[PDB]
Amino acid sequence: TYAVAFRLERGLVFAADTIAQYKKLQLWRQPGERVFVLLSAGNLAATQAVVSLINEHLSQETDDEVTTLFTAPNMYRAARVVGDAVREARSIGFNTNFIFGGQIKGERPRLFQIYPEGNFIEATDDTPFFQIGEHKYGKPILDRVARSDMRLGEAAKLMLLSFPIDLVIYERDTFDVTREKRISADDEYFRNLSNAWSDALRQAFSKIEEFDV
Amino acid sequence: TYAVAFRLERGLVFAADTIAQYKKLQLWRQPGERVFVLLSAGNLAATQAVVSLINEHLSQETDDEVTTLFTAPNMYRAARVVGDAVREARSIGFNTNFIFGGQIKGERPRLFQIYPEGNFIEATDDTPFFQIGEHKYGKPILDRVARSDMRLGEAAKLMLLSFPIDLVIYERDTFDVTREKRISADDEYFRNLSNAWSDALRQAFSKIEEFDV
Ligand code: NA
Ligand code: NA
């Protein structure tokens, strides 16, 4: 499977293609305080194991000094929580990266890519997106076109062209995921967008074939 | 590694990134009679083994009924020769596809994709190109933009944007490979082409973001 996420000035956008715990886009929320999204591209067993470890600590942790998603004071600390779950899930496709993002009150929205051993890197304005899965579809186009000042809707359109897809748009400082949408191949808007993209690409190539190589 | 080839009305274009027998683009020729190009994306040992088997039969075959690249009456028969070498090389990265194309006098230029067991498919006007390697870079762009009536130079430009690269252009009915070029990352023409492509893509996206999804 394939998933992708963008960090913009205005917020975060998450997308993944596709039984709740095995779902490739996972959401956690405390109203007005914190929101988190995990994207997976690994096999079903790997996704479930990581989510189960996160939820085990949210639901049953007795030690107050252990950090969970709901006690993490910032998104770096929250990413370490997921990193620990990703590493520990190896005890429970199996060696794919995860994407984790969200926002905690008092701090900007942040986005991370988590590796098999629980280490991670964070999205920057220079590198505002991550892709995970067997094939990072349309990476060259995202590299050339993605910008951190893009509106959330236009980022979503670019992401959808790189690919049913679960799409989540998170607006900065809202601490809720309201804009949640499932888009199938039979969606007429998405088909219309893809048709226009193909037309625009052919026109784009017709311009640049002026140049020699 | 990555390689790609196009079959056009005007001829064939081959490209591969990169010690002669391990080279990822391999050429055979009989002047004015036949030309062949093999592209590999597998490991070094796999490429050498296939080429060695092809050359063994060209150089040492004593049985006249055994088909070689130089006795094949048509390109389908020549593809079977390579297919046999690809399958037999498994006895000698290891499970990647090959691309094989060329022309024999009395017949149009033809292009094939060879699978690990020696079976193959042929390029058509509807599907005029093949890609091989770990990552089929820029497949969505080739799918949307590639056309069988493209000039050889414009096909080459499109192929180069999907990626030092060894580029071969074969013009129909010539039975020679004269237009052979090695293009590095420091090539100013290729850099200029890539810069313009990025600019054109951003402009292309700016047009199509009119549409909703
Ligand atoms: Na900009
Ligand atoms: Na056309």
Side-chain angles (χ1 to χ4, degrees):
Chain A
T1 60
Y2 167 72
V4 55
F6 267 54
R7 190 192 82 163
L8 300 319
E9 294 174 326
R10 288 187 169 192
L12 306 170
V13 187
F14 301 90
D17 61 356
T18 49
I19 315 185
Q21 209 175 11
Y22 300 98
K23 199 171 176 181
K24 300 300 180 87
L25 191 153
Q26 297 287 341
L27 177 64
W28 294 264
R29 172 163 178 273
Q30 286 191 318
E33 298 286 10
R34 49 186 71 218
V35 291
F36 307 103
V37 182
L38 179 70
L39 306 181
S40 187
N43 75 319
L44 299 183
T47 305
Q48 192 271 348
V50 172
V51 172
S52 74
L53 287 162
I54 290 162
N55 293 342
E56 177 224 294
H57 290 83
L58 294 172
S59 305
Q60 297 177 277
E61 185 52 70
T62 56
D63 191 355
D64 295 321
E65 77 204 335
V66 174
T67 311
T68 76
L69 287 191
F70 294 170
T71 63
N74 62 64
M75 279 297 301
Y76 170 87
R77 294 285 298 285
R80 285 168 59 88
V81 167
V82 176
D84 295 343
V86 170
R87 196 197 315 104
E88 289 164 23
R90 300 179 75 75
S91 309
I92 295 165
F94 297 94
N95 293 251
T96 63
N97 297 334
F98 289 78
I99 291 161
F100 180 69
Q103 195 182 8
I104 292 159
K105 182 151 278 181
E107 183 183 61
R108 70 156 298 164
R110 292 168 73 179
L111 183 65
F112 302 83
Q113 189 169 257
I114 316 303
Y115 295 93
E117 291 297 333
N119 59 302
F120 55 80
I121 55 169
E122 182 171 3
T124 62
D125 297 323
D126 294 336
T127 310
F129 71 93
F130 294 123
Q131 294 172 288
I132 55 171
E134 189 182 350
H135 308 288
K136 298 178 183 180
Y137 293 113
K139 178 174 270 192
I141 301 308
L142 298 184
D143 285 336
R144 296 162 182 274
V145 180
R147 293 294 188 271
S148 59
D149 70 343
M150 281 180 158
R151 289 174 277 94
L152 298 171
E154 75 180 295
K157 290 168 196 179
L158 179 58
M159 290 163 65
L160 286 171
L161 292 165
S162 81
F163 285 83
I165 305 158
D166 293 334
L167 174 63
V168 164
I169 296 168
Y170 175 67
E171 298 184 0
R172 186 185 193 112
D173 305 331
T174 62
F175 307 99
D176 190 16
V177 176
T178 61
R179 297 170 74 176
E180 198 278 318
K181 189 164 182 169
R182 187 166 291 174
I183 302 158
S184 56
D186 64 75
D187 197 294
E188 299 303 324
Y189 286 70
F190 181 55
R191 290 285 300 177
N192 176 61
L193 182 66
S194 183
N195 289 351
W197 182 231
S198 297
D199 291 1
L201 286 168
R202 292 185 219 105
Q203 291 176 65
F205 187 73
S206 292
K207 298 283 185 179
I208 65 140
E209 71 190 354
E210 283 182 335
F211 299 108
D212 207 338
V213 69
Chain B
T1 60
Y2 167 72
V4 55
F6 267 54
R7 190 192 82 163
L8 300 319
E9 294 174 326
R10 288 187 169 192
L12 306 170
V13 187
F14 301 90
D17 61 356
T18 49
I19 315 185
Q21 209 175 11
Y22 300 98
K23 199 171 176 181
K24 300 300 180 87
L25 191 153
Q26 297 287 341
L27 177 64
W28 294 264
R29 172 163 178 273
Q30 286 191 318
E33 298 286 10
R34 49 186 71 218
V35 291
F36 307 103
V37 182
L38 179 70
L39 306 181
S40 187
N43 75 319
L44 299 183
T47 305
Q48 192 271 348
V50 172
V51 172
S52 74
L53 287 162
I54 290 162
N55 293 342
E56 177 224 294
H57 290 83
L58 294 172
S59 305
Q60 297 177 277
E61 185 52 70
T62 56
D63 191 354
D64 295 320
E65 77 204 335
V66 174
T67 311
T68 76
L69 287 191
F70 294 170
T71 63
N74 62 64
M75 279 297 301
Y76 170 87
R77 294 285 298 285
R80 285 168 59 88
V81 167
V82 176
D84 295 343
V86 170
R87 196 197 315 104
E88 289 164 23
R90 300 179 75 75
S91 309
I92 295 165
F94 297 94
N95 293 251
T96 63
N97 297 334
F98 289 78
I99 291 161
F100 180 69
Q103 195 182 8
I104 292 159
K105 182 151 278 181
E107 183 183 61
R108 70 156 298 164
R110 292 168 73 179
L111 183 65
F112 302 83
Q113 189 169 257
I114 316 303
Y115 295 93
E117 291 297 333
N119 59 303
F120 55 81
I121 55 169
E122 182 171 3
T124 62
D125 297 323
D126 294 336
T127 310
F129 71 93
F130 294 123
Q131 294 172 288
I132 55 171
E134 189 182 350
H135 308 288
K136 298 178 183 180
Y137 293 113
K139 178 174 270 192
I141 301 308
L142 298 184
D143 285 336
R144 296 162 182 274
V145 180
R147 293 294 188 271
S148 59
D149 70 343
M150 281 180 158
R151 289 174 277 94
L152 298 171
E154 75 180 295
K157 290 168 196 179
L158 179 58
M159 290 163 65
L160 286 171
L161 292 165
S162 81
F163 285 83
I165 305 158
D166 293 334
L167 174 63
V168 164
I169 296 168
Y170 175 67
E171 298 184 0
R172 186 185 193 112
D173 305 331
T174 62
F175 307 99
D176 190 16
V177 176
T178 61
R179 297 170 74 176
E180 198 278 318
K181 189 164 182 169
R182 187 166 291 174
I183 302 158
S184 56
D186 64 75
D187 197 294
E188 299 303 324
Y189 286 70
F190 181 55
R191 290 285 300 177
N192 176 61
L193 182 66
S194 183
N195 289 351
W197 182 231
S198 297
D199 291 1
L201 286 168
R202 292 185 219 105
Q203 291 176 65
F205 187 73
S206 292
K207 298 283 185 179
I208 65 140
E209 71 190 354
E210 283 182 335
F211 299 108
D212 207 338
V213 69

